[PDB]
């Protein structure tokens, strides 16, 4: 019973006849998926898991860095006294599922408790050879094309009373978000206003389960780099930055129409992988369209002593994409075999 560092390998069903860059990377760097994957239930162990100290995330992070570093073609790169210009053709970009697999002598433990809060003992444990397929969606504020909670919404935090620790919300029902750059940089995303608010009611109640009978407010981002103040994501190689203010402007107490978010495709970005900026070429022409599933949220709670109203306010944060991967790797740990 121990978290030991093995070098994982990846597996995928990448298609050689696809131009999408994830396929090329996983084709060269991964092997095909097990056609008949075997899962083994264990002796009713209470093994401790700690999604916040899970070495898989660093390894997965490196993979996406490698993928991004050999697939994406920024026109200019600014990194510590260096600025590198290269050809920057448009790519075909649509994430594919990647499985992480333990090498010989190791295994992956899987937590199957439906209400696992992210840290602590798991009572329904199983062993697997590889993870489920995880789409490596790089985004902020909203997690797209991820995994759903199977029964109820789950709130996960390394320590929820420490306001400096990020909070990961995992939904149990997808909310579809439709973003289009209509057939050059003005674009928009639609989300059901009613479905988002009905979702907010349950999120607020779940958050309220620790902060008992307090009024819960969702409010817009307080500041930071463009990467974290807007909902950012990659759709077809273009970097969308959507004003999410209209999503996080409501209050919920012990008690259809679309929201269209104004977005812009930016050529100049601050890099998530490393401190620096990158410049990409202007958007393609033609209709740009991506439909994603909102599956979770990243929230930060304002700290400090209480002024008047019982109100706790949460604003989206994020930026360190290790937490994006964590939102998917929380149920796994790598172990050496007896």
């Amino acid at each position: 019973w121990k978290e030991a560092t093995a070098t994982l390998f990846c597996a995928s069903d990448a298609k050689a006849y696809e131009t999408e860059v994830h396929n090329v990377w996983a084709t060269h760097a991964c092997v095909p998926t097990d056609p008949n994957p075997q899962e083994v239930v264990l002796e009713n162990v209470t093994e401790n898991f700690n999604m916040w100290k899970n070495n898989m995330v660093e390894q997965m992070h490196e993979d996406i860095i490698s993928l991004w570093d050999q697939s994406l073609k920024p026109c200019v790169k600014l990194t510590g006294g260096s600025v590198i210009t290269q050809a920057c053709p448009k790519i075909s970009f649509e994430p594919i599922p990647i499985h992480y697999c333990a090498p010989a002598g190791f295994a992956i433990l899987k937590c199957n408790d439906k209400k696992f809060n992210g840290t602590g003992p798991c009572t329904n444990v199983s062993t697997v050879q590889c993870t489920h397929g995880i789409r490596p969606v790089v985004s902020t504020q909203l997690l797209l094309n991820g995994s759903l909670a199977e029964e109820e919404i789950v709130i996960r935090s390394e320590n929820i009373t420490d306001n400096a620790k990020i909070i990961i919300v995992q939904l149990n029902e997808t909310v579809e978000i439709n973003c289009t750059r209509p057939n050059i940089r003005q674009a928009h995303c639609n989300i059901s206003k009613a479905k988002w608010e009905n979702t907010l009611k349950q999120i607020a109640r779940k958050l309220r389960e620790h902060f008992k009978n307090e009024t819960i407010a969702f409010n817009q981002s307080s500041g930071g780099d463009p990467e974290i103040v807007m909902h950012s994501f990659n759709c077809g190689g273009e970097f969308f930055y959507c004003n999410s203010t209209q999503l996080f402007n409501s209050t919920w107490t012990w008690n259809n129409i679309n929201i269209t978010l104004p977005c812009r495709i930016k050529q100049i970005i601050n890099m998530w992988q490393e401190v620096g900026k990158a410049m990409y070429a202007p958007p393609i022409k033609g209709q740009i369209r991506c439909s994603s599933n909102i599956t979770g949220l990243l929230l930060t709670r304002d700290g400090g002593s209480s002024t008047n109203g019982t109100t706790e306010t949460f604003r989206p944060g994020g930026g360190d994409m290790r937490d994006n991967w964590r939102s998917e790797l929380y149920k796994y740990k790598v172990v050496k075999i007896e």
Partner: antibody, heavy 121, light 105 residues
């Protein structure tokens, strides 16, 4: 050796704005949360908020929303606090500080030397 | 919200005596994190004890920490002259209002 070196004392009139600096050395700047605190004459220590310098995420105390702006320059590893709408009861010694530990980021081993801010007409 | 009540407001003891400083929380705040700091006139505060009981580097042996997870105690086994200063307890963004340790004459 971690060291935080702040700018010198400032005099300001009510309603003005003040900028305080905090120079970091001896460590990877983006690896630790930076907090801002102040100590008014004869009063306790007040936490204004923190900034995580990697992306500039911030958290501002309830009582200072609309009054504070926190930023940083990662190319010279320096953080900056801007305060607007100064009034008399903003007079205080200001400190930036960080924890030695990365799991619990509130064990304040390293403090700036302090900046006196005097606000008067 | 954590409310930390420190006592006494002023502590009057003779040098060489043992000081017991109190910090009372308004609800259960665990034993894992509460920390104590020292501040001398004209200086920033200095971290003395972290994680209820662990002395940092350079902290004298006469400082010892204890606590139930709600109420905590800082013991100075034998006060030396330079230990007379202001002492705060803290966890996260929350601070006590301080205890001054002074010389009885």
């Amino acid at each position: 050796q971690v060291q935080l070196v702040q700018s010198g004392a400032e005099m300001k009139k009510p309603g003005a704005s003040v900028r305080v600096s905090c120079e970091a050395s001896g460590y990877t700047f983006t690896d630790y949360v930076l907090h801002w605190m102040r100590q008014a004459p004869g009063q306790g220590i007040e936490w204004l908020g923190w900034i995580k310098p990697r992306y500039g995420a911030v958290n501002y105390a309830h009582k200072f929303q609309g009054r504070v702006s926190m930023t940083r320059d990662t190319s010279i590893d320096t953080a900056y606090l801007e305060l607007i709408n100064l009034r008399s009861d903003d007079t205080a010694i200001y400190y930036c500080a960080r924890s030695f530990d990365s799991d619990y980021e509130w064990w304040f081993t390293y403090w700036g030397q302090g900046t006196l801010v005097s606000v008067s007409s | 919200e954590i409310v930390l009540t420190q006592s006494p407001g002023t502590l009057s003891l003779s040098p060489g005596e043992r000081a017991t400083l109190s910090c009372r929380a308004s609800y259960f705040i665990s034993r894992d994190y509460l920390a104590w700091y020292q501040q001398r006139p004209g200086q920033a505060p200095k971290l003395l004890i972290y994680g209820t009981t662990t002395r940092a580097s350079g902290i004298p042996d006469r400082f010892s920490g204890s606590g139930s997870g709600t109420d905590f105690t800082l013991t100075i086994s034998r006060l030396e002259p330079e230990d007379f200063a202001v002492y705060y307890c803290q966890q996260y963004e929350f601070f006590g209002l301080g205890t001054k340790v002074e010389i009885k004459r």
